[PDB]
Amino acid sequence: AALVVDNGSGMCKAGFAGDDAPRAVFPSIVGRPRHQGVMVGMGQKDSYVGDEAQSKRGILTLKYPIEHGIVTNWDDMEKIWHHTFYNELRVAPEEHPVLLTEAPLNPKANREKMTQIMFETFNTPAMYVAIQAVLSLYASGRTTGIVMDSGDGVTHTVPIYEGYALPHAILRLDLAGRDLTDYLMKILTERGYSFTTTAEREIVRDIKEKLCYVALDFEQEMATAASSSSLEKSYELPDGQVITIGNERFRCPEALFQPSFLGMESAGIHETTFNSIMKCDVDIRKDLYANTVLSGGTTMYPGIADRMQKEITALAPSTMKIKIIAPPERKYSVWIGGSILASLSTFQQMWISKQEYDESGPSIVHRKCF
Amino acid sequence: AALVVDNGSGMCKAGFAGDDAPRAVFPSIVGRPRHQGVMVGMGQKDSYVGDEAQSKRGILTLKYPIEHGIVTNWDDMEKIWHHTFYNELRVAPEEHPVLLTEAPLNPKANREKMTQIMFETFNTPAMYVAIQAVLSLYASGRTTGIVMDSGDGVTHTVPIYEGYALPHAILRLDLAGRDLTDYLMKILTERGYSFTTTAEREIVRDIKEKLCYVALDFEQEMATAASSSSLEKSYELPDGQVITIGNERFRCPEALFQPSFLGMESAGIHETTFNSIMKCDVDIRKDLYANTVLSGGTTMYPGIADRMQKEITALAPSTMKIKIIAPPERKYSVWIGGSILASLSTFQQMWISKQEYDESGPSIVHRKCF
Amino acid sequence: IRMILHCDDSMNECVEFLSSDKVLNQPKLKADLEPYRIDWANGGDLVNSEKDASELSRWDYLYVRLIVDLGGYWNQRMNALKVKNIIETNYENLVRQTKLIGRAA
Amino acid sequence: WXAXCPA
Amino acid sequence: WXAXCPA
Ligand SMILES: Nc1ncnc2c1ncn2[C@@H]1O[C@H](COP(=O)(O)OP(=O)(O)O)[C@@H](O)[C@H]1O
Ligand SMILES: Nc1ncnc2c1ncn2[C@@H]1O[C@H](COP(=O)(O)OP(=O)(O)O)[C@@H](O)[C@H]1O
Ligand SMILES: [Mg+2]
Ligand SMILES: [Mg+2]
């Protein structure tokens, strides 16, 4: 059974090949205590990783090891992988090959560092590394299409063809879940709620996942929200306080389609998807339009499928047909696609064996698995 | 002439447009006698507002109507404004327009009640609300730079590239002069001095204003103070006792650059300036670096400009040059900038007329003012 | 206008404002102020017959007399002062930076 | 404030 | 105490 570990900026999913759901899904944070300890004999640890950090997040400084898709701290990344195998999964990687997932347009330094870290610290027998966006379409069951990969890192639009990522057609986008979370607390201060610390950032993320939604029409919804109190909903903080949000429900997710709210010159995810398609060839343009698949936790807002379809329809020519595919399992689309690829019989051919790694060195990752 | 009232968390300044200095500067405190009146010869008013309460602060419970730039008690705020117009400025508000100041990233209800009070209690012909940090740049004769304002409640960094401030790059911290005063009396107990009541709080503020200074090198200065003498200063209390403070002279201002002493996860006043600049465009970063402006009473410590320059230089790339501008009259920079704006002929069309407020109610303050 | 053209010390801070693109890039404003300009390049006389400058406001009078009037050599003059200011300050630290890099190698 | 701080 | 209170 080959492990399928999908590291991510927000959450990392781990499990086994052939399963339909990840075994362990915990936040990818590494918190350290900022206060000195007074009670002796408790055996308190120095660093808390995963669910332990979230439970005790009040007295910790939560730092995300991965920011904007690049690992800014390679010492904390080893801590999370160590916690994934021994603690959450309780399986020694000595007898199980490990599958890792990259990000589109990843620097070559990260590619070799991931191979070097695991082949020595964990010494797994075999490895294969694949693109997260590529695996997103594999879970949906189609090999050709354009993936609107979004998450807590950076939004990527990768129009893969025949299971291969087009390198020139990939368009980056920094609009992600973290930006909306930071933007939500900036506009929540207008009602008198002040969330500033990193511990309270997790609280805002819970609000975004439960109450926020995408409105079909922004101008129509704005007038309705001001006139009537129907749109207001109540949320309860961990301390017992009750808060009310009236029109922030459809104003924070709207920043995806209108980045000018955050002050970014780049266009929204509706126009980036259209721009990426235009970069591809004319003949294969027909197939990509009808096989667009959303992925990641950012695209889980209610009504985002309808808003995206309507707005991309106007930009696209009237001859083109739009079919936004939004599977309900799109949160774990990256992991599920990885499990499908690992379980394949022909997948044994492109393993990176431990014996082959020593003779070739860390540079084998560039040419073997691409 | 147009009255320019700059209500502040600690002190409020009121005057006339075109003047070079505020006419009246008194503390923004409202006190009520906790003890029972025993004599009948004198008036023995219910409450005292301004410097009247400061003189009799022994027998009163001083309460600040403004906390962190938000008016917590609107009953006491009406007392202060009634005292400003009728006792200090001794003018009728019914004939002169009034210009007010509000901190950025404030609750919408804070400036909505300000419009309602002005147009219903004092019947001012016109009104306007302006950002405190924006006016601080006008007093220095600049229209392109970053303003580091710091008072009693708010310490906000507002990068202003043009006549209008950049909204997406505004950073606000709830660490200011009042927070340092509470920290100064906490570490003063280490030497055996106990200041608890609000009347004793005003004594600590005098000590902070006269003896505290920012050390260029905190680690080196702590070792120097460990050798005793050459750094202890003597202060005389209103009772008559003489107190000596050693390393507390620079420890209290050091909480600005190291907020971890107060248990706040927020970054220091030096990092929050660099972070604010990083949110702007690449082309504009060159101008903002060389046009940094300090303002407010908190930044009046001896040597804060020198210390701030060193900290920013290490964080900023060595190619860029850092020039911190510290005008001699930066205490009244907020009011002086407002005087220039009010006296401008173009500003006559930006006033909110009485008829305009009636047709739209208090909500017009959000759409017109900024 | 006499203090600005004198390159006095007190006018250093505000002369950077006149070098910004916002002031110079006013195609509509320049056309309207064209009849009021003075051809100082040759003759130094009014282009039009009367075009009295007293009717203009305080700021219009300053703009036409400085930007529109001297637009032939204003940009070159501004570039001459921008370079001088940079050399007066950035040259001192630049020498130190080159020495440190060479010494480290 | 309402939620957070004291103001 | 020294300054403040009696202790
Ligand atoms: N139901 C939901 N509605 C809205 N946003 C969500 C929802 N679930 C998760 N998110 C956002 O998506 C992010 C999770 O990103 P994720 O897809 O795990 O990143 P990665 O692709 O790197 O694994 C979280 O930060 C959260 O803010
Ligand atoms: N000379 C000084 N040295 C140090 N701190 C000062 C000095 N003068 C004023 N302050 C601080 O500045 C604060 C008030 O500054 P100011 O901005 O003028 O008023 P406000 O903050 O109400 O707008 C006071 O609380 C005081 O602690
Ligand atoms: Mg992803
Ligand atoms: Mg102030």
XYZ file of N, CA, C and O in Angstrom, chain B residues 166-229:
256
model
N -4.148 55.402 0.520
C -4.338 54.056 -0.007
C -5.106 53.222 1.009
O -4.602 52.995 2.114
N -6.308 52.748 0.688
C -7.125 52.061 1.697
C -6.684 50.631 1.966
O -6.836 50.131 3.085
N -6.142 49.957 0.952
C -5.817 48.544 1.087
C -4.528 48.294 1.860
O -4.291 47.158 2.284
N -3.696 49.317 2.057
C -2.410 49.155 2.724
C -2.369 49.832 4.089
O -1.282 50.097 4.612
N -3.525 50.118 4.677
C -3.582 50.765 5.983
C -3.478 49.698 7.064
O -4.258 48.740 7.083
N -2.511 49.858 7.963
C -2.304 48.944 9.077
C -2.531 49.694 10.379
O -1.955 50.766 10.588
N -3.363 49.130 11.249
C -3.734 49.754 12.510
C -3.441 48.796 13.654
O -3.801 47.617 13.588
N -2.789 49.304 14.696
C -2.453 48.525 15.878
C -3.037 49.193 17.112
O -3.031 50.423 17.223
N -3.542 48.383 18.036
C -4.084 48.894 19.293
C -3.017 48.939 20.382
O -3.185 48.410 21.480
N -1.895 49.582 20.067
C -0.793 49.779 21.002
C -0.323 51.217 20.855
O 0.223 51.592 19.812
N -0.528 52.021 21.889
C -0.239 53.445 21.802
C 0.164 53.942 23.187
O 0.532 53.150 24.060
N 0.102 55.260 23.383
C 0.617 55.849 24.609
C -0.080 55.349 25.860
O 0.553 55.179 26.905
N -1.393 55.121 25.781
C -2.118 54.654 26.958
C -1.694 53.245 27.350
O -1.643 52.916 28.541
N -1.400 52.394 26.366
C -0.944 51.043 26.674
C 0.410 51.060 27.373
O 0.650 50.266 28.288
N 1.308 51.953 26.951
C 2.608 52.061 27.605
C 2.478 52.571 29.033
O 3.260 52.174 29.902
N 1.512 53.456 29.289
C 1.300 53.946 30.647
C 0.893 52.816 31.584
O 1.365 52.746 32.725
N 0.021 51.919 31.121
C -0.354 50.768 31.935
C 0.819 49.820 32.140
O 0.894 49.143 33.171
N 1.733 49.744 31.171
C 2.925 48.922 31.333
C 3.953 49.578 32.241
O 4.674 48.879 32.959
N 4.047 50.909 32.213
C 5.007 51.600 33.066
C 4.678 51.404 34.538
O 5.575 51.172 35.355
N 3.396 51.491 34.898
C 3.009 51.291 36.289
C 3.064 49.828 36.698
O 3.085 49.535 37.897
N 3.076 48.904 35.736
C 3.227 47.494 36.075
C 4.662 47.174 36.471
O 4.895 46.450 37.447
N 5.641 47.705 35.731
C 7.045 47.475 36.061
C 7.572 48.457 37.094
O 8.700 48.284 37.578
N 6.802 49.490 37.443
C 7.212 50.378 38.521
C 7.041 49.733 39.886
O 7.727 50.128 40.834
N 6.146 48.750 40.009
C 5.997 48.032 41.268
C 7.232 47.214 41.612
O 7.418 46.860 42.781
N 8.075 46.903 40.625
C 9.303 46.170 40.905
C 10.239 46.967 41.802
O 11.042 46.381 42.536
N 10.157 48.292 41.757
C 10.967 49.143 42.617
C 10.263 49.520 43.912
O 10.870 50.187 44.756
N 9.013 49.111 44.094
C 8.282 49.406 45.307
C 7.293 50.545 45.226
O 6.798 50.982 46.270
N 6.990 51.046 44.032
C 6.026 52.123 43.850
C 4.733 51.547 43.296
O 4.749 50.819 42.299
N 3.614 51.876 43.938
C 2.308 51.336 43.576
C 1.389 52.478 43.163
O 1.013 53.309 43.995
N 1.027 52.513 41.881
C 0.048 53.456 41.351
C -1.101 52.649 40.761
O -0.919 51.945 39.762
N -2.279 52.745 41.375
C -3.425 51.938 40.973
C -4.593 52.768 40.466
O -5.091 52.515 39.363
N -5.047 53.753 41.236
C -6.263 54.474 40.888
C -6.048 55.351 39.658
O -4.919 55.646 39.256
N -7.166 55.764 39.054
C -7.103 56.608 37.865
C -6.462 57.956 38.166
O -5.829 58.551 37.287
N -6.624 58.459 39.390
C -5.928 59.679 39.779
C -4.419 59.472 39.775
O -3.663 60.361 39.370
N -3.962 58.302 40.228
C -2.540 57.986 40.181
C -2.066 57.664 38.771
O -0.858 57.685 38.517
N -2.986 57.358 37.854
C -2.599 57.115 36.468
C -2.056 58.381 35.818
O -1.131 58.317 35.000
N -2.623 59.539 36.160
C -2.145 60.794 35.588
C -0.746 61.140 36.077
O -0.017 61.870 35.396
N -0.357 60.640 37.250
C 1.002 60.859 37.735
C 1.999 60.070 36.896
O 3.083 60.565 36.564
N 1.648 58.834 36.536
C 2.542 58.002 35.735
C 2.761 58.622 34.361
O 3.874 58.595 33.822
N 1.707 59.193 33.775
C 1.840 59.805 32.456
C 2.833 60.960 32.479
O 3.556 61.184 31.502
N 2.878 61.710 33.581
C 3.866 62.775 33.703
C 5.282 62.214 33.741
O 6.200 62.785 33.140
N 5.481 61.102 34.450
C 6.796 60.469 34.495
C 7.207 60.003 33.106
O 8.357 60.185 32.687
N 6.274 59.396 32.372
C 6.579 58.912 31.030
C 6.935 60.061 30.094
O 7.843 59.935 29.263
N 6.234 61.189 30.214
C 6.453 62.304 29.300
C 7.793 62.993 29.513
O 8.280 63.661 28.596
N 8.401 62.850 30.688
C 9.592 63.614 31.039
C 10.864 62.786 31.108
O 11.934 63.289 30.761
N 10.789 61.531 31.551
C 11.988 60.741 31.786
C 12.200 59.611 30.792
O 13.352 59.239 30.548
N 11.137 59.062 30.212
C 11.273 57.926 29.311
C 11.931 58.341 28.003
O 11.696 59.438 27.490
N 12.763 57.451 27.466
C 13.425 57.680 26.190
C 13.680 56.338 25.523
O 13.711 55.294 26.177
N 13.866 56.377 24.208
C 14.086 55.172 23.418
C 15.582 54.942 23.274
O 16.318 55.829 22.824
N 16.035 53.753 23.656
C 17.445 53.409 23.559
C 17.785 52.940 22.151
O 17.011 52.216 21.519
N 18.951 53.366 21.659
C 19.392 52.946 20.333
C 19.654 51.446 20.285
O 19.306 50.778 19.305
N 20.270 50.900 21.331
C 20.556 49.472 21.427
C 20.042 48.980 22.772
O 20.655 49.254 23.809
N 18.917 48.264 22.757
C 18.295 47.838 24.007
C 19.181 46.865 24.774
O 19.308 46.969 25.999
N 19.795 45.908 24.074
C 20.624 44.917 24.753
C 21.844 45.561 25.400
O 22.200 45.230 26.536
N 22.497 46.482 24.691
C 23.673 47.144 25.245
C 23.302 48.063 26.402
O 24.036 48.151 27.393
N 22.169 48.761 26.293
C 21.774 49.696 27.341
C 21.378 48.975 28.624
O 21.585 49.510 29.719
N 20.802 47.777 28.511
C 20.444 47.016 29.705
C 21.682 46.643 30.510
O 21.668 46.698 31.746
N 22.759 46.250 29.828
C 24.006 45.944 30.522
C 24.592 47.185 31.183
O 25.140 47.105 32.288
N 24.497 48.337 30.516
C 25.011 49.575 31.096
C 24.269 49.935 32.377
O 24.888 50.330 33.372
N 22.941 49.799 32.374
C 22.159 50.078 33.572
C 22.433 49.078 34.687
O 22.159 49.381 35.853
N 22.961 47.897 34.358
C 23.288 46.913 35.383
C 24.466 47.345 36.245
O 24.636 46.815 37.349
N 25.279 48.289 35.773
C 26.407 48.791 36.546
C 26.012 49.898 37.514
O 26.883 50.408 38.227
N 24.733 50.283 37.536
C 24.187 51.284 38.450
C 24.735 52.680 38.171
O 25.787 52.833 37.541
N 24.002 53.701 38.624
C 24.380 55.105 38.484
C 24.454 55.538 37.024
O 24.345 54.711 36.113
